[PDB]
């Protein structure tokens, strides 16, 4: 068990991305000492017994990160906590699927759902519950390869039922979140239970009422969303299961997803004043 402290002198040319609820997110170049490398990084800077929680959390970030999980590099401590991670060139996935509504295909779409599921399968192994899984928290490394990030806390509409009412979070409750994430992607980035306000959700989730089958979706794919949305959380599928099935579908996707017959704003924005080799040193 150990931890890597970055001092600001290393962290160079630093510009803002966005002010999220958990805090602010910037970008910049990282020049570790002794190492001649320059590294494009993402820096998060957040905002009594919440702080002590901030240890055991990111200490779990030691170890062998999955190809599909965003891996922490280390921390800059100023008067605030800056978490530093390698920059994903294509920004966030939701934006990506939103911006790509027209061009996208089913080959791409299942390929991801496999990946996210495989990433979640890994965190499942390393005994850390995510709590906020949503399309908003999947980043795009390349048009074919994606990473899950964040895991560290008011989004009810991605939450499980027990998570709402009892405030208990297992890996099974992360599967619900996942289901909603898949729907998100099959809807080309739709907002779940739009117009239906947050108060009523638990109330009428009990009515067994759920998100409607996405247009481009087959029953074979839709069954799995509903599988995740079982109140009886034990009757939800294990992440390993999700990966296997999503692998089946990827070997004939037009049989499972029906579309017709690829750019990023964010990536385009990077092409100025500063993106290669992964750098897991
Ligand atoms: C527009 C907005 C409001 O800023 C939302 C927003 O986050 N937009 C996307 C920002 N973004 C774009 C490329 C990209 N590549 C990588 N990380 C990004 N963002 C990011 C998100 C969460 C972070 O914080 C955590 C917390 C917990 C765990 C980890 C870990 F390292 F394990 F993955 C990182 C950090 Cl450091 C960065 C990236």
From Swiss-Prot:
Entry comment on modification after translation: Autophosphorylated. Autophosphorylation occurs in trans, i.e. one subunit of the dimeric receptor phosphorylates tyrosine residues on the other subunit. Ligand-binding increases phosphorylation on tyrosine residues. Dephosphorylated by PTPN12.
Disease field: Glioma: Gliomas are benign or malignant central nervous system neoplasms derived from glial cells. They comprise astrocytomas and glioblastoma multiforme that are derived from astrocytes, oligodendrogliomas derived from oligodendrocytes and ependymomas derived from ependymocytes. Ovarian cancer: The term ovarian cancer defines malignancies originating from ovarian tissue. Although many histologic types of ovarian tumors have been described, epithelial ovarian carcinoma is the most common form. Ovarian cancers are often asymptomatic and the recognized signs and symptoms, even of late-stage disease, are vague. Consequently, most patients are diagnosed with advanced disease.
Outcome following mutation: residue 144 to S: In OC; uncertain significance; somatic mutation
Subunit-structure text: Homodimer. Heterodimer with EGFR, ERBB3 and ERBB4. Part of a complex with EGFR and either PIK3C2A or PIK3C2B. Interacts with PLXNB1. Interacts with MUC1; the interaction is enhanced by heregulin (HRG). Interacts with KPNB1, RANBP2, EEA1, CRM1 and CLTC. Interacts with PTK6. Interacts with RPA194 and ACTB. Interacts with PRKCABP, SRC and MYOC.
Catalytic residues of the enzyme: 132
Residues of the full protein shown: 713 to 1022 of 1255
Tissues expressing the protein: Expressed in a variety of tumor tissues including primary breast tumors and tumors from small bowel, esophagus, kidney and mouth.
Effect of residue 46 to P: In LNCR; uncertain significance; somatic mutation
Role noted for this protein: Protein tyrosine kinase that is part of several cell surface receptor complexes, but that apparently needs a coreceptor for ligand binding. Essential component of a neuregulin-receptor complex, although neuregulins do not interact with it alone. GP30 is a potential ligand for this receptor. Regulates outgrowth and stabilization of peripheral microtubules (MTs). Upon ERBB2 activation, the MEMO1-RHOA-DIAPH1 signaling pathway elicits the phosphorylation and thus the inhibition of GSK3B at cell membrane.
Protein kinase domain segment(s): 11-257
The name this protein goes by in its record: Receptor tyrosine-protein kinase erbB-2
Encoding gene (name): ERBB2
Record-stated family: Belongs to the protein kinase superfamily. Tyr protein kinase family. EGF receptor subfamily.
């Amino acid at each position: 068990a150990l931890l890597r402290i970055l001092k600001e002198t290393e962290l160079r040319k630093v510009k803002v991305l966005g002010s999220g609820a958990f805090g602010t997110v910037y970008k910049g170049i990282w020049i570790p000492d002794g190492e001649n490398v320059k590294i494009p990084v993402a820096i998060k800077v957040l905002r009594p017994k919440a702080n002590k929680e901030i240890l055991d959390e990111a200490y779990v970030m030691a170890g062998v990160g999955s190809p599909y999980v965003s891996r922490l590099l280390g921390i800059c401590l100023t008067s605030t906590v800056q978490l530093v991670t390698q920059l994903m060139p294509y920004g966030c996935l939701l934006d990506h699927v939103r911006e790509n509504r027209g061009r996208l295909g089913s080959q791409d779409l299942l390929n991801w759902c496999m990946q996210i599921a495989k990433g979640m399968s890994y965190l499942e192994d390393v005994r850390l519950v995510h709590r906020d899984l949503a399309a908003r928290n999947v980043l795009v490394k390349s048009p074919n390869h994606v990473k899950i990030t964040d895991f560290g806390l008011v989004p009810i509409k991605w939450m499980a039922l027990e998570s709402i009412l009892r405030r208990r979070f297992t890996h099974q409750s992360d599967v619900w979140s996942y289901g909603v994430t898949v729907w998100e992607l099959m809807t080309f980035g739709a907002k779940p239970y739009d117009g239906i306000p947050a108060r009523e959700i638990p109330d009428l989730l009990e009515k067994g009422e759920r998100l409607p089958q996405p247009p481009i979706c087959t029953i074979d794919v839709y069954m799995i969303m509903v599988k995740c949305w079982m109140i009886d959380s034990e009757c939800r599928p294990r992440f390993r299961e999700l990966v296997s099935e999503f692998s089946r579908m990827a070997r004939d996707p037009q049989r499972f997803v029906v579309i017709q017959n690829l750019d990023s704003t964010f990536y385009r924005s990077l092409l100025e004043d500063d993106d290669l080799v992964d750098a897991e040193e």
